[model samples]
Target: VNSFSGYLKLTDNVYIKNADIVEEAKKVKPTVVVNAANVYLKHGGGVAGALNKATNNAMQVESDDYIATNGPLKVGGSCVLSGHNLAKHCLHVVGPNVNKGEDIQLLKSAYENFNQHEVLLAPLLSAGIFGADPIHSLRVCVDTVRTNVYLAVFDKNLYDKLVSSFL
Candidate 1:
């Protein structure tokens, strides 16, 4: 398993490396980590799309892992309402539902919760939706979140395109 912790200099750079995640988390030591869920379709899968699915389960399990190995307690479910996860002290935001603006409010609230040094582990897009485009959703997400945010994505190419076009 790979750990992600640190500070990001560029907001537009899309990263999928495990080392990158760990390094960033270590440097930042974020108070709160916001993760987007991971979901996949039968045929179509992009960087952001794939990551959304991977993190959905991985995030939950990892939280459990954190509780077993590390300190604190294992927290699960939607971070927006729940507040904390297993390994992580707090998880902000929730999985993106099919309805638009579902994640917007959660994100806004998560941002407001921050006081000092904090890092957000946000996904690129709202994956697992039938009619949604991963790149498009990610673009909007990155834009909505505040700057100095550490985004963990599974698709480097798609992330690059999003950053190039937007941000």
Candidate 2:
């Protein structure tokens, strides 16, 4: 199960795992990465932080342009654009917050915007600094995932080192 290490196989296409988003991508390449945050681009925190470092914030100028016009992103919305350092493209989305229940409803519809060909790399949305419990968040992410969810789960590491460094 080493290849399946962090994941519990929910199905051939679905999975749930606790791993470093970037580190997992290194081993098994994913075509798309999700920027789980606001349009201000909280790339310095949580999963966004890991990718910000990897891509050297290549999408910042691009994201800033969008935010200036559209404002901070809300649920049921996203920006799919080219990726820089690791993956070929990035899907920037604002998931439901850890503070409320509406986000769970929001989670149900988030990935419907994408097509099925994508191989995604995403974190447990709203889990770390955003405050939702990881396992509960993971279940929500998995149960609702489709088209745009990570196909394989990997990337485990020191529990808080990456995500908490910026917190």
Candidate 3:
């Protein structure tokens, strides 16, 4: 079985978890599943890779078609496309690359894209090679989205630290 632990409530209908993000997304089937991605929308690895593979890689092709038609989405911008085999729709958000430049406002914009959705299932965005501070991103997530949220945190150590911070 997949390993995980959580249910730390941030507010009404909001939770943080040290769980498998892909598995949680599949189980929750929220209105929109957020993917931290680049402007190209390629599911190269990490959370994006798992989601793309879970959908049998069809999401990538859809993303390709979307970019072909709409052009590369700017950082902080987002786009919605069919989730294929996962949720009803997947929201692809391009967050800031801090190695290049860090813009807290732009990162906040990434989470803001969830504003219109009734439910949000999101992962830690921009905290990988993108270089966003985990605590800061977590706070941004908690502060921004108004919808019911399940923050799928895959790292147990970070999860514990974050949970402690929240408490």
Candidate 4:
């Protein structure tokens, strides 16, 4: 079974906290790893926090770094947001607000790509602007995507859920 933990910052750019799922995935040596994380501009105090500053710096450190490092893949939905830096091939889906149905379609596309030997990755529901409640957003994302293998990354603030065993 995978081990889930709170978020940990390994450096100003990279981290490994709450990565039990990733560790488990590594064991399988799967061709693709899907990251259902949330990318938020409000994080780190609206682009003013040290973490926020670090993320921006990391983004410019290299285009082949971070999200883009995974290479190109099919992106789903109108989920692309400016400055939501990612390093990879993506297919932006146009649609209404990110609702349950939309989430399912996105997951379907990601899974389809994965099945086709494409490395599929995506942010968890509400992991973006939806909200900071990990479980709530996760439920929405999972309800749709329902992939057998998945990974999620959360920030320090949301780590509290792990502490309380509420996530």
Candidate 5:
């Protein structure tokens, strides 16, 4: 089996899950999926990499427009993917390299791009190299999106911490 832990609801239509993000996205089949990325749309590793491979690197086209207009995607700025994936669209944001603070605001902005999306599969943006606390991202994602927001996490340690945190 794919080695995963559990799935729990954070709020109405929002959840904290332990599974491969791509696989979960396939299962949830939301209207949009958030791709935690950088300015260049260079998805080579981590969540970005997984999303890149799954979507056939479709964000590259959207990346050019995003880079030109937003110059690295400042809050609420977004890119849409039209590939044949579970989600018809993908929201790309340049995940910051920070531990906390403004990155949260940026994340909120990212979600604002599709305030009315019926369903969205999202990861804790900036939790990896960005050094953000997944707990914080969880709350933010819950607060930012009104639709279904699901965070797919594969790290068991993190899953335990997450469960103990708010369960």
Candidate 6:
């Protein structure tokens, strides 16, 4: 079972949970499953890989079709496609990769660009291999998200700290 550690008051339902992003998407049935995607929008590794796997690579095909039609997504930009068997839609968003020296501004733009969705389900954008600080990434999510969100946190230590600090 998935349980939210707490919710921020910014939106009526800004929830945080220590759960698998794919599982949460399956159970919660949020309108959009936001993937922490690469600029090329390939669903190869990390969060993207898991989600694509969950959808049986249908999402990956949609991603490939998207890029074939639209070209590479710029940092901070996003594109939406069918979520396959999960949420109603899957939003592929490119957050900053710290190794490339991209910073919070681009990260914030990724968050900001996708908030128009009604109920957003997301991982910690740019906070994994892309290297945005987890807490800082959560802050950006909080600051920019205008609608309800369910943020799934995978690390237990960071999950605890986020609950302690934000809950």
Best by lDDT: 6
Give TM per candidate: 0.43, 0.71, 0.90, 0.33, 0.76, 0.89
- Residue range 1-167, candidate 6, lDDT tens digits: 23334544434556777888898788767778899899887888889999999989988888888889988999998888888888888888889999678866888899886667867788888987888888888888888887777888888898888777763
Better by TM-score, candidate 6 or 5: 6
Q: Write the per-residue lDDT of candidate 5 for residues 1-167, one digit (tens) a residue.
A: 12223557667766777778888777656667778776666677778888778767665555566567756555446566553475677777655547434555676766565466665667777777667777776666667778666677768788778778863
lDDT of each: 0.40, 0.60, 0.80, 0.34, 0.67, 0.81
lDDT of 2: 0.60
Ordered from best to worst lDDT, the candidate numbers read 6, 3, 5, 2, 1, 4
Task: Assess candidate 3 and give its lDDT.
Answer: 0.80
lDDT of 1 at 102: 51
Q: Lowest summed-lDDT stretch of 10 residues in model 6?
A: 1-10
lDDT by residue for model 2 over 42-138, one digit each (tens)?
Answer: 5767667767777677767667777788778767467776767657778877767656454566654555444444457666565555565555555
How would the candidate models be sorted by TM-score, starting from the highest? Answer: 3, 6, 5, 2, 1, 4
Per-residue lDDT of 5 in model 4: 33
- The regions of model 1 sitting more than 4 angstroms off are 1-29, 37-92, 99-117, 128-131
User: What is the Cα-based lDDT of residue 28 in candidate 5?
Assistant: 59
For model 6, the superposed segments whose C-alpha errors exceed 4 Å read 1-13
Please report, as a residue range, the 10-residue window in candidate 3 with the lowest summed lDDT: 1-10
